[PDB]
Design a protein around this ligand. Structure first.
Ligand code: HEM
Ligand code: HEM
Ligand code: HEM
Ligand code: HEM
Lengths: 137, 146, 146, 137
């Protein structure tokens, strides 16, 4: 992340604010519908519309992203527990991080018309790819 | 691509509201901003060196209209996309040598632009149908690589 | 999916020399070592915890023979790769949920294995012919996603 | 990169030596022939077999990698000017770094069989992916 990327990501996620958990849950729902192969990582989940399990998991994802934006200069350390979980235990295919990242961008675009400018879109894309790199490392 | 009648209706109902003079330029412009290697294919369009330069570039807007028209033609023939894209595939693969990963990226940028414009109306099921569409378009445009 | 006579000669001259008992296991093992998320699909194979464990694993060797046999079948039917891999495409896409990017990765690992075994004989043009083949196999195996 | 990856890359790449130009040129030719889309980055080159321009450029690519192996713990600084060149000036598609990295692995496998073990293959792949991440940042 360039200093400009970090500034844009901090600003946009600040507008996300208290809606982060709702947006995380929505991104997961979009991912499970648009890319149903991703459902195979969640055998113990109810994946139906309005699932409390998908909602709760979305807020966990959102909390992790909020911690990442708060520690954007030290994301490998800030996200350390999640790398072992995703890369070693779950063995999540790196392609699926691109799928969830896209669904997070779609969710942010649908909820933050004014903030989701082309420049901020580009910074958020790089931020989510950087998060993905940590979780697949 | 095959959509059910329910998915077809959702996609077409939204597509009728799309500003075909702007959305194509917005999707193409965002592709050039978010993925700047794509600018290499549009050097004749002039200044692409900043986001505002790209988004306000008249050639980007004009070209984006052509791109969106091809998506519109494809929506008219989802079960036989070769009937819309066979020659465009020759152009992009044999003549321009565009890496086909960028077809996928442009489709996903278009999905983001649709979400940006339609907000809550761009529901997860509507998105899922559009993802089927843009994947089929990307695959049809890559046919000459296959 | 169309090779020129030069590309066909490159492929066939080398393939007759390939050890079909070993090369598939070598490519599958290296896939599991180099791209460790692919191990998710092979939990039934047992110990994959180190490179030496993977490369010496009897199930890896045995399965690799089957994978290479499918590549050989594809080489015998270059003009009909979609029909050659239709059943396997159903298996990998509908039943195993393997993302098709991994088909590309395994094809490229096989190319590395051929280079490793054949050295100077695996010239840039010979490689280029094999890249056309493994791209065709990957696209045919991914057809059920389209 | 783990210390084991760094050790693996150092011994394997150390075997290149004075073959740097030859192997770099060969990897480039493998890329241009196998993946003709990559040629759009070199309209200003003669790309025919035995091109002196490809030979000279192959030595630069290989020598840059040698410098990167020497500074494997601080590659962002060791490749910083080349990152500006590729990511900002030339705007090289990230896909093409995967293609060149694969062709470099093929070249090393064809010339250094004993060194290209599965473990070393994995380390070299990680090394080239890390180089690629710096050059696309
Ligand atoms: C921006 C990217 C991602 C972030 C920030 C993220 C974050 C998280 C977090 C915070 C947890 C919970 C950790 C815990 O409770 O101990 C988790 C678990 C999990 N994640 Fe991710 N994740 C991401 C991407 C993905 C992707 C792409 C997949 C698969 C397609 C995935 C699949 C899972 C699964 C299966 C679990 C375990 C769920 C359970 O068993 O309860 N994650 N993730
Ligand atoms: C994936 C969906 C895409 C669609 C539906 C599409 C559609 C089109 C259409 C309709 C034309 C006009 C062809 C003509 O007038 O002969 C065109 C031309 C062109 N396209 Fe695409 N395109 C797509 C993706 C891309 C991408 C991803 C790139 C580059 C990264 C690209 C680069 C070009 C170029 C360079 C031209 C020629 C422009 C010129 O004449 O200066 N296209 N495309
Ligand atoms: C790209 C070329 C590939 C070919 C030609 C190929 C071929 C085959 C063949 C012939 C079988 C045996 C099917 C049967 O006996 O019914 C098989 C099974 C299987 N393949 Fe592939 N495959 C390829 C790629 C992959 C990849 C990339 C993965 C995962 C990363 C994968 C995962 C599997 C699995 C999990 C099985 C079932 C093994 C078992 O549990 O018995 N394949 N494949
Ligand atoms: C391991 C990855 C790479 C390394 C280490 C690398 C290294 C270099 C170096 C050192 C130069 C400077 C040449 C000079 O100053 O004369 C250069 C230039 C260049 N690179 Fe790369 N490169 C890499 C990947 C790529 C890829 C994947 C592409 C495109 C497919 C590319 C395209 C170019 C171009 C077009 C130039 C300008 C060459 C010239 O005009 O002389 N590079 N690269």
């Amino acid at each position: 992340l360039s200093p400009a990327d970090k500034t844009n990501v901090k600003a946009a996620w600040g507008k996300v604010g208290a809606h982060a958990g709702e947006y995380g849950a929505e991104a997961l729902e979009r991912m499970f519908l648009s890319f149903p192969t991703t459902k195979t990582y969640f055998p113990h989940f109810d994946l139906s519309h309005g699932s409390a399990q998908v909602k709760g998991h979305g807020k966990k994802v959102a909390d992790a992203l909020t911690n990442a934006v708060a520690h954007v200069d030290d994301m490998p350390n800030a996200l350390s527990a999640l790398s072992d979980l995703h890369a070693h235990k779950l063995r999540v295919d790196p392609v699926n991080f691109k799928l969830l990242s896209h669904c997070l961008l779609v969710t942010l675009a649908a909820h933050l018309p004014a903030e989701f400018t082309p420049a901020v879109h580009a910074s958020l894309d790089k931020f989510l790819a950087s998060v993905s790199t940590v979780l697949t490392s | 691509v095959h959509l059910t009648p329910e998915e077809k209706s959702a996609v077409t109902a939204l597509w009728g509201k799309v500003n075909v003079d702007e959305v194509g330029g917005e999707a193409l412009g965002r592709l050039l901003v978010v993925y700047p290697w794509t600018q290499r294919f549009f050097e004749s369009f002039g200044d692409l060196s900043t986001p505002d330069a790209v988004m306000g570039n008249p050639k980007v807007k004009a070209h984006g209209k052509k791109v969106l028209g091809a998506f519109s033609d494809g929506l008219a023939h989802l079960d036989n996309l070769k009937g819309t894209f066979a020659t465009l595939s020759e152009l992009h693969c044999d003549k321009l040598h565009v890496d086909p990963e960028n077809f996928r990226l442009l489709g996903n940028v278009l999905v983001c632009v649709l979400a940006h414009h339609f907000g809550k109306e761009f529901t997860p099921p509507v998105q899922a149908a559009y993802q089927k569409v843009v994947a089929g378009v990307a695959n049809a445009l890559a046919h000459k690589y296959h």
